[PDB]
């Protein structure tokens, strides 16, 4: 995430499962600019990116 | 409780609590003395409220206890009364919370999946809670019986 790593949920069928928390201890803040584009991957072919 | 969902209501709406919400949190906490007395009556009457609860349940539904019924034998009949002790306990929570929110997420959400998956007739357990309701409201005055009975019939509604 542009905020820390404990912000993107698990991409499962049905969720609200955020593993990073007070119980897991696996956190990683990184500095991201006010504008920036994450590199998403198309669930499908490649030219429809 | 009324305090937690009056908050999460006004929480979602991006606003604070109105007088309609804060004159009822106020009205509920002054009601709190009378609620603990009502729950205190059902707390140490579980011996009679449950055992007489299963009294009328078997007289009205002898199939569930007869050979072939789900609660047949010394074993299942003990668990047959165990669930009534559960639901009688949750009604004591709902009376003190001033809402069926404790009864909602315990013993009501997905209850049909459990009892259908246990082979238990869900209509039969609904008959059990109704028998407990007549015993419970018989232990309290009219002003209280409109509450203690009031939480049972909600459990009756969601259990069918």
């Amino acid at each position: 995430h542009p905020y820390g790593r404990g912000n993107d949920p698990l991409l499962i069928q049905f969720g609200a499962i955020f593993p990073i928390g007070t119980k897991n201890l696996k956190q990683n803040p990184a500095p991201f600019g006010k504008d920036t584009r994450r590199l998403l991957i198309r669930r499908g072919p490649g030219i429809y990116n | 409780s009324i305090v937690t969902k009056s908050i999460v209501n006004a929480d979602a709406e991006a606003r604070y609590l109105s007088p309609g919400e804060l004159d009822r949190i106020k009205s509920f906490v002054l009601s709190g003395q009378r609620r603990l007395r009502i729950a205190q009556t059902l707390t140490e009457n579980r011996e009679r409220i449950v055992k007489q609860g299963g009294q009328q349940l078997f007289q009205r539904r002898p199939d569930v206890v007869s050979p072939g019924g789900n609660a047949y034998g010394e074993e299942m009949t003990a668990t047959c009364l165990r669930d009534l002790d559960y639901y009688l306990r949750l009604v004591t929570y709902g009376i003190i919370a001033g809402d069926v929110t404790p009864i909602e997420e315990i013993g009501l959400v997905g209850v049909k999946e459990m009892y259908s998956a246990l082979g238990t007739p869900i209509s039969g357990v609904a008959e059990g809670i109704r028998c407990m309701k007549d015993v419970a409201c018989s232990l309290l005055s009219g002003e209280d019986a409109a509450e203690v009975g009031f939480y049972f019939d909600y459990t009756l509604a969601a259990m069918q």
Binding site: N7 | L30, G32
Partner: protein
């Protein structure tokens, strides 16, 4: 997301027992302060903008986070602050009514200090803003009500630290 009644019911339910004298003893203690919390949450709703205006002017208004280079320089960044301070004064109001700080870490504290480090928001100036905001909140609601509302401010400051 549990209030004092929800937390009392949970602990009494998690052992499978009824609400004995000790569980109702705390519940009676919560109902006694039910009148105090609403009036505390009443005035805080009225003076929400005034409290935040008093805190920032008293803690971090003229410090060099306010000047160029500081963490609060641009108008978007300044406007994010009073938006950000509004949640602390708002969610603390919810904890003051519910009588349980479970809503704070559920909806505020988790991923918060990990987020400010990402943006580079100074946690030191943030807590002093909340401390100053706690100081003005004790002005409005009184002493004991300020003790109640103040009890959740430092809970935010502790976990945010």
């Amino acid at each position: 997301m549990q209030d004092a009644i929800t937390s009392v019911i949970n602990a009494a339910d998690v052992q499978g027992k009824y609400l004995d004298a000790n569980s109702v003893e705390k519940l009676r203690g919560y109902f006694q302060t039910g009148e105090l919390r609403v009036r505390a949450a009443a005035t805080i709703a009225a003076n929400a903008a005034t409290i935040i205006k008093e805190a920032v002017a008293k803690s971090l208004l003229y410090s060099d986070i306010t000047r160029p280079g500081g963490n609060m320089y641009t108008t978007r960044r300044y406007a994010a602050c009073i938006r950000d301070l509004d949640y602390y004064l708002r969610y603390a109001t919810y904890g003051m009514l519910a009588g349980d700080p479970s809503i704070l870490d559920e909806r505020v504290l988790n991923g918060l200090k990990e987020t400010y480090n990402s943006l580079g928001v100074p946690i030191g100036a943030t807590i002093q803003a909340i401390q100053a905001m706690k100081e003005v909140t004790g002005s409005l609601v009184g002493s004991d009500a300020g003790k109640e509302m103040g009890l959740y401010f430092d809970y935010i400051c502790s976990g945010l630290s």
